[PDB]
Amino acid sequence: SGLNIKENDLPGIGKKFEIETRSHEKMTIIIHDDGRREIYRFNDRDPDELLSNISLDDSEARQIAAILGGMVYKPQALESIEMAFSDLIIEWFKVEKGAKSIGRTLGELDVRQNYDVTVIAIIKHNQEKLLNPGADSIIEENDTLVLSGERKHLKKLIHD
Amino acid sequence: SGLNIKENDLPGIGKKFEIETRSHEKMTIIIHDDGRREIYRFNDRDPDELLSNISLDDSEARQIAAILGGMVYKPQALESIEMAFSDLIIEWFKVEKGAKSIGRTLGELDVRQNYDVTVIAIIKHNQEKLLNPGADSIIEENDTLVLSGERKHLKKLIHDF
Ligand SMILES: Nc1ncnc2c1ncn2[C@@H]1O[C@@H]2COP(=O)(O)O[C@H]3[C@@H](O)[C@H](n4cnc5c(N)ncnc54)O[C@@H]3COP(=O)(O)O[C@H]2[C@H]1O
Numbered sequence: 001s002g003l004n005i006k007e008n009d010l011p012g013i014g015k016k017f018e019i020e021t022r023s024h025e026k027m028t029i030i031i032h033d034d035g036r037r038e039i040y041r042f043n044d045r046d047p048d049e050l051l052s053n054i055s056l057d058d059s060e061a062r063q064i065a066a067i068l069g070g071m072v073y074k075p076q077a078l079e080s081i082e083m084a085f086s087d088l089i090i091e092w093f094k095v096e097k098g099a100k101s102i103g104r105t106l107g108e109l110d111v112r113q114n115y116d117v118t119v120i121a122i123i124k125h126n127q128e129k130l131l132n133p134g135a136d137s138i139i140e141e142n143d144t145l146v147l148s149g150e151r152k153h154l155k156k157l158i159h160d
Numbered sequence: 161s162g163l164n165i166k167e168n169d170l171p172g173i174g175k176k177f178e179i180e181t182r183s184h185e186k187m188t189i190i191i192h193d194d195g196r197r198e199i200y201r202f203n204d205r206d207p208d209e210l211l212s213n214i215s216l217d218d219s220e221a222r223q224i225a226a227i228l229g230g231m232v233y234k235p236q237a238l239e240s241i242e243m244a245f246s247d248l249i250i251e252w253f254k255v256e257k258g259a260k261s262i263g264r265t266l267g268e269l270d271v272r273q274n275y276d277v278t279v280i281a282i283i284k285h286n287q288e289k290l291l292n293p294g295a296d297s298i299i300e301e302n303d304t305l306v307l308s309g310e311r312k313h314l315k316k317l318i319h320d321f
């Protein structure tokens with residue numbers, strides 16, 4: 001369930017992350033300051049044996065990271081997640097029928113000001129994602145809100 | 161970009177993404193509705209030859225993605241990026257000497273309202289990072305603002321403040 005990750009500075013070059021999974025599999029990610037990533041996969045039992053490696057530019061790396069991280073397709077069973085080494089909880093809430101928010105804006109609800117919750121995205125029924133909504137974003141039926149904040153504050157906002 | 165991506169539905173399982181790089185390297189990511197991911201790497205000249213594979217749970221996939229995506233260590237030389245699967249831009253902007261925004265709050269500057277730019281993080285001179293700042297976060301002398309928005313809007317904000 002829990003990763004082991006060893007990080008080391010590569011002075012003037014970038015950083016190195018050596019990851020070991022629950023499955024007993026090893027991956028090393030080198031991030032260069034110019035944006036290039038190199039990934040190496042090693043034999044579990046014999047880490048001197050390289051299994052595969054790949055180079056990626058900054059754009060490629062971020063696209064793959066968005067897919068892997070559930071930013072393109074979100075696993076349907078996960079309703080909330082908790083960041084490692086953090087209390088920050090991200091929660092996906094679908095506005096039901098007859099919620100008081102329906103038809104009202106982020107500014108009118110004053111979500112961040114009055115609840116300390118940040119709406120980081122809005123998923124429409126047509127499934128397009130609006131990133132960083134602002135005060136004038138209207139909340140509608142069946143829209144999914146992507147909320148970031150502390151659990152206490154999230155419960156409060158949802159309850160209201 | 162530089163990536164050929166194909167997405168297909170896997171009924172009762174989740175989704176499959178087949179990715180091919182600019183340099184013609186290929187991987188397949190399976191994303192389960194239960195949170196599990198598997199990643200497969202294949203020979204670029206023979207898609208049926210498996211080079212390696214790895215199995216991950218949701219928390220692991222998210223941590224690895226954050227490393228891969230530059231959210232743990234940022235490549236130092238990058239000043240801005242075109243966001244993945246978006247037309248939005250992310251820019252790192254260092255507030256320097258005599259900048260008129262210094263000592264003023266995001267509320268008072270009213271950045272998102274007036275410039276349609278979202279400050280998504282603030283990184284102080286000492287590399288400490290504040291995620292999703294609010295109206296009461298104060299802009300200070302050597303801060304780096306992590307800005308998100310459209311090209312035209314970013315240019316006006318930087319020019320004005
Ligand atoms: N991270 C950031 N980056 C750039 N500028 C920032 C910012 N945080 C706050 N501001 C600026 O401060 C003003 C006051 O924000 P506040 O959170 O008090 O009051 C907000 C908040 O209660 C609500 N709101 C707007 N967008 C929101 C979102 N994405 N999530 C949650 N609440 C939001 O609407 C009110 C008015 O927002 P508006 O944008 O007109 O005005 C905002 C915005 O111009």
Ligand SMILES: [Ca+2]
Pocket residue numbers: 107110113
């Ligand atoms: Ca208000």
